[PDB]
Amino acid sequence: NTIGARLNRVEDKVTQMDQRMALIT
Amino acid sequence: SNTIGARLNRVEDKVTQMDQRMALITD
Amino acid sequence: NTIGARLNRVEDKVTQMDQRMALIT
C-alpha cells in the first residue's frame, strides 16, 4: 500500500487510541 | 534507515503493539 | 502540511502516548 494511504491510517489510529484513553483516564 | 518511509514503518509497528496492549487497558 | 511534518507530528503523538501506557502496563 501507498505511503499516503499508510500515513493517514496511522494518524487516525493514534487519534482513536487517544479517545479510548480519554474515556478511561 | 531514516527516510520518511523507513520511519513510517517503525511508527506503524509501535502503533500496532500499542493498540493490543490497549485492549488490556480498556475497550 | 508537508509529508515530513505530518510524520513528525505523528511520531510526536505516538511517543507521548507510549509513555502514558508504559506507566500502566
CSV table of C-alpha atoms in Angstrom, one decimal:
chain,number,residue,atom,x,y,z
A,1,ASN,CA,0.0,0.0,0.0
A,2,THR,CA,0.9,3.7,-0.5
A,3,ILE,CA,2.8,5.9,1.9
A,4,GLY,CA,-0.1,8.4,1.6
A,5,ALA,CA,-2.6,5.6,2.5
A,6,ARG,CA,-0.4,4.3,5.3
A,7,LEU,CA,0.3,7.7,6.9
A,8,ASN,CA,-3.5,8.5,7.1
A,9,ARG,CA,-4.3,5.2,8.6
A,10,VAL,CA,-1.8,5.8,11.4
A,11,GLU,CA,-2.9,9.4,12.1
A,12,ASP,CA,-6.4,8.3,12.8
A,13,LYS,CA,-5.5,5.2,14.7
A,14,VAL,CA,-3.4,7.3,17.1
A,15,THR,CA,-6.5,9.6,17.3
A,16,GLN,CA,-8.6,6.5,18.2
A,17,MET,CA,-6.3,5.2,21.0
A,18,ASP,CA,-6.2,8.7,22.3
A,19,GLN,CA,-10.1,8.7,22.6
A,20,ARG,CA,-10.2,5.3,24.2
A,21,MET,CA,-7.6,6.7,26.6
A,22,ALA,CA,-9.6,9.9,27.4
A,23,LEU,CA,-12.7,8.0,28.3
A,24,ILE,CA,-10.8,5.9,30.9
A,25,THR,CA,-8.1,8.2,32.3
B,1,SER,CA,17.1,3.5,7.6
B,2,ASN,CA,15.8,7.1,8.0
B,3,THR,CA,13.7,8.1,5.0
B,4,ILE,CA,10.1,9.1,5.7
B,5,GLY,CA,9.4,5.6,4.5
B,6,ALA,CA,11.6,3.7,7.0
B,7,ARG,CA,10.4,5.8,9.9
B,8,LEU,CA,6.8,5.3,8.8
B,9,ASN,CA,7.4,1.6,9.2
B,10,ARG,CA,8.7,1.9,12.8
B,11,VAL,CA,5.7,4.2,13.7
B,12,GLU,CA,3.2,1.7,12.4
B,13,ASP,CA,4.9,-1.2,14.3
B,14,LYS,CA,4.8,0.8,17.5
B,15,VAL,CA,1.1,1.7,16.7
B,16,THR,CA,0.2,-2.0,16.2
B,17,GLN,CA,1.7,-3.3,19.5
B,18,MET,CA,0.3,-0.3,21.3
B,19,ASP,CA,-3.2,-1.0,20.0
B,20,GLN,CA,-3.1,-4.5,21.5
B,21,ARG,CA,-1.7,-3.5,24.9
B,22,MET,CA,-4.6,-1.1,24.8
B,23,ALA,CA,-7.2,-3.9,24.8
B,24,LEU,CA,-5.7,-4.8,28.2
B,25,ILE,CA,-6.4,-1.2,29.5
B,26,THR,CA,-9.8,-0.6,28.0
B,27,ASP,CA,-12.2,-1.3,25.2
C,1,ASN,CA,1.3,20.3,5.7
C,2,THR,CA,4.3,18.5,4.2
C,3,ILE,CA,4.7,14.7,4.5
C,4,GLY,CA,7.7,15.3,6.8
C,5,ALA,CA,5.9,17.5,9.3
C,6,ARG,CA,2.9,15.1,9.3
C,7,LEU,CA,5.2,12.1,10.1
C,8,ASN,CA,6.9,14.2,12.7
C,9,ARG,CA,3.6,15.1,14.3
C,10,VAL,CA,2.5,11.6,14.4
C,11,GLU,CA,5.9,10.3,15.9
C,12,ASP,CA,5.4,13.1,18.5
C,13,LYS,CA,1.9,11.8,19.4
C,14,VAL,CA,2.8,8.1,19.4
C,15,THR,CA,5.7,8.9,21.8
C,16,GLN,CA,3.7,10.9,24.2
C,17,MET,CA,1.1,8.1,24.4
C,18,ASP,CA,3.6,5.3,24.8
C,19,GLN,CA,4.9,6.9,28.0
C,20,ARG,CA,1.3,7.0,29.3
C,21,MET,CA,0.8,3.3,28.6
C,22,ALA,CA,4.2,2.4,29.8
C,23,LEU,CA,3.1,3.6,33.3
C,24,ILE,CA,0.2,1.2,33.3
C,25,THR,CA,1.4,-2.0,31.7
